[PDB]
Amino acid sequence: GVLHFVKYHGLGNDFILVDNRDSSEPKITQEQAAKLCDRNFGVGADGVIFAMPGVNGTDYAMRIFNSDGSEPEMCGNGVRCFARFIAELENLQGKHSFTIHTGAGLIVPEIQDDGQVKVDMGTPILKAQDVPTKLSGNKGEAVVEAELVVDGVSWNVTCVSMGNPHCITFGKKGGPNLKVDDLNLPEIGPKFEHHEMFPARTNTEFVEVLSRSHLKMRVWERGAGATLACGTGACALVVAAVLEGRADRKCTVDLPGGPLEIEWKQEDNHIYMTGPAEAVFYGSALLH
Amino acid sequence: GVLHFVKYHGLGNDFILVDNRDSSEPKITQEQAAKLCDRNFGVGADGVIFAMPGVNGTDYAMRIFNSDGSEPEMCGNGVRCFARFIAELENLQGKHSFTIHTGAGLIVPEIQDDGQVKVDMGTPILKAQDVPTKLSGNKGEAVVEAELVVDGVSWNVTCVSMGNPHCITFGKKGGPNLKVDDLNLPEIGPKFEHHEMFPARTNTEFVEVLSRSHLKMRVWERGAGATLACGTGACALVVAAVLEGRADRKCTVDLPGGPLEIEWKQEDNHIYMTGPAEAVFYGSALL
Amino acid sequence: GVLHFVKYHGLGNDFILVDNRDSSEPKITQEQAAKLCDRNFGVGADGVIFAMPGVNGTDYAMRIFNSDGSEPEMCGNGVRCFARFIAELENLQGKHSFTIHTGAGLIVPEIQDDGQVKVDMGTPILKAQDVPTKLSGNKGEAVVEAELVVDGVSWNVTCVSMGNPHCITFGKKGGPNLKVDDLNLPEIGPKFEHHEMFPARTNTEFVEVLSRSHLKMRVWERGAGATLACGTGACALVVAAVLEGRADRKCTVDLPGGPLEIEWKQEDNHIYMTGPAEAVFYGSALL
Amino acid sequence: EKFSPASFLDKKETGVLHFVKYHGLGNDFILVDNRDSSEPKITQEQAAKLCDRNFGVGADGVIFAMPGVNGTDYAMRIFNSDGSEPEMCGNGVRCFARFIAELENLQGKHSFTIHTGAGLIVPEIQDDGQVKVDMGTPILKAQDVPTKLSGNKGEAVVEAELVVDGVSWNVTCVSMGNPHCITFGKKGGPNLKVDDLNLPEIGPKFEHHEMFPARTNTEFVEVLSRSHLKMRVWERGAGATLACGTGACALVVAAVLEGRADRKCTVDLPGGPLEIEWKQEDNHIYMTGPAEAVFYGSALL
Amino acid sequence: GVLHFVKYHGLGNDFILVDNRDSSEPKITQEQAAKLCDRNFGVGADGVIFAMPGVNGTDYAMRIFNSDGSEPEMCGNGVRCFARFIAELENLQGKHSFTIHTGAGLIVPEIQDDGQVKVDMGTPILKAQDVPTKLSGNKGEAVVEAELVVDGVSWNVTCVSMGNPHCITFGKKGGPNLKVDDLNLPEIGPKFEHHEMFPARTNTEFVEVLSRSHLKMRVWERGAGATLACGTGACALVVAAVLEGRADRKCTVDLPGGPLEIEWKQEDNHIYMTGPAEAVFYGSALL
Amino acid sequence: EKFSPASFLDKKETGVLHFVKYHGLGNDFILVDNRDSSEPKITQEQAAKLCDRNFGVGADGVIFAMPGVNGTDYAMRIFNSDGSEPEMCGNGVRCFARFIAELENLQGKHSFTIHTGAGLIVPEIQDDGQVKVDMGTPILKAQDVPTKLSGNKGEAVVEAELVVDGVSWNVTCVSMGNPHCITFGKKGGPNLKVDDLNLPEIGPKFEHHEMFPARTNTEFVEVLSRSHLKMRVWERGAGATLACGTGACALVVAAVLEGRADRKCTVDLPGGPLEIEWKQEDNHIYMTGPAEAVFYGSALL
Ligand SMILES: C[C@](N)(CCC[C@H](N)C(=O)O)C(=O)O
Ligand SMILES: C[C@](N)(CCC[C@H](N)C(=O)O)C(=O)O
Ligand SMILES: C[C@](N)(CCC[C@H](N)C(=O)O)C(=O)O
Ligand SMILES: C[C@](N)(CCC[C@H](N)C(=O)O)C(=O)O
Ligand SMILES: C[C@](N)(CCC[C@H](N)C(=O)O)C(=O)O
Ligand SMILES: C[C@](N)(CCC[C@H](N)C(=O)O)C(=O)O
């Protein structure tokens, strides 16, 4: 078989985008996606994103498979690429917004004049059971700066879902601030990702506060590893920073691949994420 | 501002192959190749290989740019991919062989009946000055199991060129055999690659002898890092194993991505390398 | 005057496509179209197809003039060329579907991943006098494997309309299966085309069944002659094959210029046709 | 769909050819301005594809206007629709003259010298707009035509027997740079009614005959009067065309050699008439006929 | 810094076109534009035109700086160049039209089959104070063939705005028809351009009527001087010719650099201008 | 629309010229790297088109940096905006020097030897970035300027009568490879206020005068002091430019010969000042002035 696609990246978080507007079922299996995402034996990507037909009135729907083949419920860098991809297919020039049905609910990206995409990422989910996490809520049903014992070491974490689960930490329990570049993600990351307290596994964001409006982070993603950026993660860590009282609702988040502008609007409780999305190459891959 | 190409890999050492038969000048610059080889911002590859017009009578010529943009003189996994590419482009089925002009001289791949590609990789260069290395020859003009001080630690190395430079080590001076999987390549690799004793930098192969006909290795390549396989490297390390008296001329070399059959024939001093090569996808990249 | 156009072909059924989105009236007359279609004195084509403004909500409308100047009500190969032509004018990339108003009613082409076009050709018309044919229905209101006397010789034919009229035959009455390549179309074709039983003339398809899902055919088109392919004809002959019990609803139809995939869906009674369409050249003709 | 790196690379390697379409009595050609180079802009294989009437532009051939040679104003090279390269083309050189006149904004009478594979050819747009061409002198020596038939009238092959698929025909051979086999009928047979011939059937048997090493063009002739001939032609590499200028010149030479017609004749071809004159004064043949532009464009290669 | 641009001209009225689609803020200042427009010390042009993001729904917006640095509200020759610039940047083929927001309101250029551009230049503004001019309206609120004293000499003029102001004259009050080529524009032009009756200065068109459908003109433009052509000027002078009863609504206007086809439609009060636009070179200018 | 195969084929965007735009005191030029050949990359006709300010790139001329001749580092050829080829250009060679320094990434003081139609010219980039050029020696012999005026001071034409459109002017003739006609006023007339002259009117009468076989550049001079001259120029083939380096050199030579100024003068040109010195020690003339890059680009041909 043959899979036609277009390669895009949002701050280095790269994806295989496929036009699946003709069917409600993804053109390839999760197993095929995992093979295609292998960087040496396949096309190479952090995931495969499908542009599908709208659901209940939305312009389109989006489904995504992580490079390990699992299906997460949303992807911020990916939805910015999705908007640019649709624009290319439909010859839409300049500013345009679309309603997208996703596993996290309604998401509304709007292409900006400069080509970046400002996305309405919806509202954060903080109730422990729905994140989901087995940690007990310590601020209402929300888990904020709570103890998580990781391989015998006590860390403090805040849990938030953007449809997908995030475990955000600013450091160990009773410990100093983090210098995220000093962390050994391949070592510590998997211990959070597969922790027994996260039934569906979790994405993990390690954060260093530079100022109340400027945060630096590294992320170990569920099913994708140490990526250059994670949009849902940047949204979740700003929510966590606000809940822990370490930063304000509008921050610039520096991710390994570059910055994102995040704002958690108190007026509507929605989170807006603005960042770039760029097409890299067009192709056809051999399917097995 | 668009490059059409086909992606291939030889044991996981993956490349962007471009049909450059219509010109003597590579279609893209070394700087553009480095960008295209970036795995997250580009197409992603260990290098870009160009199929160019023959030279002085060869069927074709091959030029390659490492993912860092530098231009090495040969690539074994790459030439096996080159052979599949040509057969694809010329609709050649079954056994076929082509003469290819490279920076290492004449190279002759031959697609076998079983589909694998057996390549005549030329003869190894052992004279120290030509590898090139500033290390002094201790076995005739060759550098064999000689001391190399790496970040203050003494290692024993053997140097051989397959057009490109290789530094092969079976362990530290006065040290035990290596368990290559225990090495931290990102840490030790760059120290060999940019060592002052290698004027043009060097590829480095770490080897574990399993038997006199079976070697296991990991490699830190000049300009490409810790790749899954290196064909010139596998050829050079068998030459080194023979010179150090650790193995015979015919060996199976296990590389991270898989095995290669290597034979340094005493009959003609040529080294033959047999391995796979597979197309993965094709497309057009924005430049 | 000057007519600007783009030449396309669908399996060799070639057309002159003109951007007529500016007016509800075709830019040239039927007489001018016939002249332009002359292969040695004009541009050369089986027809001229106009991309016109939508009607009652459709994205566009399509009108076509045969190479003899007559105006048929639809064209399958032509609408596949139309879809690629419009995609170009709208700067669209990849898959796109369009609603097109035609003399056969709504037609919906959809560009596929491989550049091919799958078209919802609507539902077939089988009522005898609406085909139109003067032959009496012999199976319900339809004419199925009925006797047609052509120049004194009895043939059995099935009539179906895809907006335009089709007369399909699998052979003479009481005769063996056909070897379509042995037919002399220039001789027999005109006798069917202008037959008194077809008031508006008819397209004629001669069919050879290779299997229940594989049919071979040749066609003598109303106003265009022995073309390399006819999409409405391929659709009509599959309908005829099903009605005569000779084949399944899903078939590969081999036409002189190539194959088409046809499916007369039992679920909705719609017929889907998938085939290629390619641009050949851009031009300006003297009027 | 099949994964095919080969097909894919071909598709993205498409070129473009700008041209103007002309026809001389229905013998239609793709004219290209190649004055910028001594090498034809496209290959013979590409020309064959472009000449396909359903999958390409459609034509009996592709004609290139090239830079002059050893003096001449221009040079002309032509590829048949089958891709082969013939030495000359009469209807084509009349189209060539119009093409040049159009490109150089030349109005009224104008003559150009053209270098061809048949030697010097000199077309001249007439006051009345038609193009009268000095087609040079005919080649009659058998081995130079070329034909393996033995000269039977001096070194020329005139009304000689040619066994075609076991049937004896009488033919006359003459070259206008390109080879021509002219017949007025079968040996010991009646005059021909050319419209009754089945060219697709008989044509190929002459075209590829073993007696014509470089293949041949074949003209079937019906004499209407000593100054009026009717013909049909099966051309080497182009088939049953509507007209052939070198053919009309060759058949008048043949008619004169066989004593059937005068040196000044009106020749009726499927697409129309040509005025031909084989001047005894200088042995040159003059051909007068029309040429018209039809459309112009850019073809994908 | 550096400014990348493409040079175009519409009948010799030449401009520096810049791709400013990424921001509503022009890439350079008015002062920088004046410097770049200097023909000996800069790039040389009658103005700089920016292709910007759409506004309130239009496909794009256009802003222009005259060679003196002032910002006029529209430019007809420039919008034709703008349309070809977009087509080039987007590799659009065939007929395409775009909605453009300008200081004069909506303007809609459409690329024609022959490559010319036909533009819906909007509707003319005749109310004196909106032109703007301080002359009193003498035909309703419009100034038509009214006395304007220029440096002590009485001229009759008609004022119309196409977003930008235009003062059209067919001659002096009580004087004969003009032979525009005999005028000394560098001398008389500035006296109209900076006249006290034109608060925002004005463009001035001198017209010679050749027939009721054929007008010859020369223009002295506000902020650009004696240019080879002015599209808004050609539209305004046809409006003036109609108002003065000297010509019909559809005219060919001969400007120094060539002709424009102009039509002021009574059906909707819109004026359509058709003419050429050609790219000359592209470059990068030092800022 | 008219059917026009010719227009269609012309419109097929032939070639492209890469260049860099420079100006010396407003005398602006298109500089092209032509170091790979002794033949200019474009024709004189193409240069004239490119120099059109509204339809082309716009310039007073096109200057080619060519390969050295007889050991010089480089050679320079220039085409005026009217297409004619003059033998030297002072403002141009200063731009040429900076162009070279850019192509060779040369920093600081540098001098190159340039072969020109005027012979050897040697520009040197100063520390301040200005360029001081050794313009060679001036040619004063009447017939070598060339001019048909009789030498009235040795073999030189100094303050001699030239009847221009019936009016008597006094002029001095000097060549800097190219011809120059310098005037400080009419015969028996007062000093000039150069800004009051109507150059487009009087200029062409001198430029095409019968006494100048190869036409001539004309400099109108107003002496401000013995070391300060103001001028305007009407150049052969370029018109009223903002500055002319060879002209500034020639008018200082003329001022000295007529005894109106010293060998070292500041010359005020419309676009700015130039420092000129006619060294008595070697009879060489040195011109110092600026040169600036403006933009670079690619023009359609
Ligand atoms: C694409 C993404 N990195 C999220 C990917 C999904 C994530 N790996 C998960 O398993 O939830 C983003 O939000 O930008
Ligand atoms: C492609 C290759 N790994 C060699 C690549 C070139 C190598 N990185 C070098 O710089 O010499 C091989 O021999 O298989
Ligand atoms: C273009 C077409 N061959 C139909 C052409 C119309 C046909 N000649 C007719 O007169 O009905 C098709 O259906 O593909
Ligand atoms: C164009 C032409 N028909 C001749 C074409 C060349 C001919 N097919 C050949 O192969 O000799 C003519 O002479 O008019
Ligand atoms: C570019 C233009 N000449 C108008 C330029 C604007 C004019 N100089 C003004 O100041 O109004 C046109 O309308 O074609
Ligand atoms: C460029 C220049 N103005 C001279 C140009 C050549 C002059 N137009 C001539 O024809 O002699 C100079 O000397 O500076």
Q: Please give the DSSP secondary-structure letter assigned to residue B202.
A: -
Residues C47-71, buried b or exposed e (16+ Cβ, 10 A)? bbbbbbeeeeebebbbbbbbbbbbe
Q: How far apart are CA E95 and CA E118, in angstroms?
A: 11
Residues of A in CB contact (< 8 Å) with D are: 1-2, 284, 286-287
Ligand at shortest distance from the CA of C104: 3
- Indicate the SS3 state at residue A237: helix
| Type of residue numbered F301 | L
Q: How far apart are CA F108 and CA F131, in angstroms?
A: 11
Of D130, D245, D124, whose CA–CA distance to D178 is shortest? D245
Claim to verify: residue A168 and residue A265 sit in the same structural domain: yes
Q: How far apart are CA A253 and CA A262, in angstroms?
A: 7
What's the CA angle centered on C239, arms C237 and C242, to 5 degrees? 105
A284 vs B42, B283, B286: nearest CB: B283
- Answer whether E69 contacts ligand 5 (Cβ < 6 A): no
Of C259, C255, C196, whose CA–CA distance to C226 is shortest? C255
Beta bridge partners of D171: D160
Burial class (CB in 10 A: 0-12, 13-18, 19+), C211: exposed
Q: Other C-beta atoms within 10 Å of F168: how many?
A: 12
Ligand at shortest distance from the CA of A201: 1
- Indicate the SS3 state at residue A243: helix
A263 found inside a domain = yes
Instruction: Collect all residues of chain C within an 8 Å Cβ-Cβ radius of residue F1.
Output: 1-2
Of F80, F64, F30, F32, whose CA–CA distance to F241 is shortest? F80
Question: What Cα–Cα distance (Å) separates residue C152 from each residue in A8, C149, C187, C213?
Answer: 68, 6, 14, 33
- The token duo for B140 is 């005739």
Which helix (H) or strand (E) covers residue F205, if one does? helix F199-207
Claim to verify: residue F147 and residue F276 sit in the same structural domain: yes
- The token duo for F247 is 């002209």
D82: Cα within 13 Å, side-chain hemisphere: 9
Method used to obtain the model: X-ray
- List, in order, residues 6 or more apart from C268 with CB less than 8 Å away: C123
Strands (E) in chain F, as ranges, are: 16-24, 27-33, 61-67, 74-80, 110-111, 114-116, 119-125, 131-134, 160-164, 167-175, 179-183, 217-225, 228-234, 264-269, 272-278, 285-289, 292-300
Instruction: Collect all residues of chain B within an 8 Å Cβ-Cβ radius of residue D43.
Output: none
- Answer whether B163 contacts ligand 2 (Cβ < 6 A): no
Beta bridge partners of D131: D125, D289
C-beta separation of E122 from E106 below 8 A: yes
Query: Is D183 labelled as part of a ligand binding site?
Result: no
C92 vs A4, A21, A90: nearest CB: A90
D102: Cα within 13 Å, side-chain hemisphere: 27
Strands (E) in F34-107, as ranges, are: 61-67, 74-80
E151 found inside a domain = no
B152 found inside a domain = no
Claim to verify: residue D126 and residue D147 sit in the same structural domain: no
Ligand at shortest distance from the CA of A10: 1
Claim to verify: residue A85 and residue A137 sit in the same structural domain: no
- The token duo for E225 is 């001087």
Burial class (CB in 10 A: 0-12, 13-18, 19+), A152: exposed
Radius of gyration of chain A (CA): 18
Q: What is the CATH number of the domain that holds D93?
A: 3.10.310.10
Q: How far apart are CA C66 and CA B4, in angstroms?
A: 40
Residues A100-137, buried b or exposed e (16+ Cβ, 10 A)? bbbbbeebbbbbbbeebbbbbbbbbbbebeebbbebeb
Annotated catalytic, D95? no
Burial class (CB in 10 A: 0-12, 13-18, 19+), A60: buried
Q: How many Å lie between the centroid of ligand 6 and the Cα of residue F205?
A: 18
C-beta separation of B271 from B123 below 8 A: yes
A151 found inside a domain = no
Claim to verify: residue E187 and residue E197 sit in the same structural domain: yes
Question: What Cα–Cα distance (Å) separates residue E137 from each residue in E42, E134, E149, E158, F12?
Answer: 42, 9, 15, 10, 51
Q: How many Å lie between the centroid of ligand 3 and the Cα of residue C67?
A: 10
Claim to verify: residue E26 and residue E88 sit in the same structural domain: yes
Claim to verify: residue C204 and residue C244 sit in the same structural domain: yes
Which helix (H) or strand (E) covers residue D220, if one does? strand D217-225
Claim to verify: residue B107 and residue B124 sit in the same structural domain: no
Of D34, D23, D24, whose CA–CA distance to D103 is shortest? D34
Q: How far apart are CA A217 and CA F48, in angstroms?
A: 61
C-beta separation of C227 from C189 below 8 A: no
E237 found inside a domain = yes
| Residue A234 φ/ψ, nearest 5 degrees | -60, -40
Q: How far apart are CA C128 and CA C142, in angstroms?
A: 5
How many independent structural domains does chain D possess? 2
Claim to verify: residue B108 and residue B172 sit in the same structural domain: no
C24 found inside a domain = yes
Q: Please give the DSSP secondary-structure letter assigned to residue C242.
A: H
Q: How many Å lie between the centroid of ligand 6 and the Cα of residue A76?
A: 63
Query: Is D246 labelled as part of a ligand binding site?
Result: yes
Longest C-alpha distance within chain B, in Å? 55
Q: How far apart are CA A13 and CA B140, in angstroms?
A: 53
Q: Look up the domain containing C3 and give its range.
A: 1-117+275-287
Considering only CA atoms, which residue is closest to atom 4 of ligand 3? C75
Q: Please give the DSSP secondary-structure letter assigned to residue F38.
A: S
- List, in order, residues 6 or more apart from D97 with CB less than 8 Å away: D110, D112, D123, D124, D125, D131, D133, D291
Say how many residues make up chain C: 287
What's the CA angle centered on A199, arms A196 and A203, to 5 degrees? 90
- Indicate the SS3 state at residue B233: helix
| Residue F113 φ/ψ, nearest 5 degrees | -100, 125
- Indicate the SS3 state at residue F11: coil
A152 found inside a domain = no
- List, in order, residues 6 or more apart from E138 with CB less than 8 Å away: E144, E145, E146
C-beta separation of A67 from A34 below 8 A: yes
- Chain E residue at shortest CA distance from F242: E40
Q: Please give the DSSP secondary-structure letter assigned to residue F190.
A: -
Claim to verify: residue F146 and residue F281 sit in the same structural domain: yes
Of D134, D162, D133, whose CA–CA distance to D147 is shortest? D162
Instruction: Collect all residues of chain D within an 8 Å Cβ-Cβ radius of residue A287.
Output: 3
C241 found inside a domain = yes
C-beta separation of F164 from F212 below 8 A: no
Claim to verify: residue D99 and residue D235 sit in the same structural domain: no
Q: How far apart are CA F137 and CA F297, in angstroms?
A: 36
C-beta separation of A17 from A85 below 8 A: yes
Chains A+D touching (3+ CB pairs under 8 Å)? yes
Q: How far apart are CA A238 and CA A252, in angstroms?
A: 9
Claim to verify: residue D175 and residue D259 sit in the same structural domain: yes
Instruction: Collect all residues of chain E within an 8 Å Cβ-Cβ radius of residue A95.
Output: 53-54
If one residue of C81, C160, C161, C203 were mutated to test the ligand 3 pocket, choosing by the most ligand atoms within 8 A of its CB, it would be C203
CB pairs under 8 A between E and F: 63
- In the numeric block, the tokens 């120099």 are attached to F51
Q: How far apart are CA E217 and CA E207, in angstroms?
A: 5
The catalytic residues of E are: 75, 230
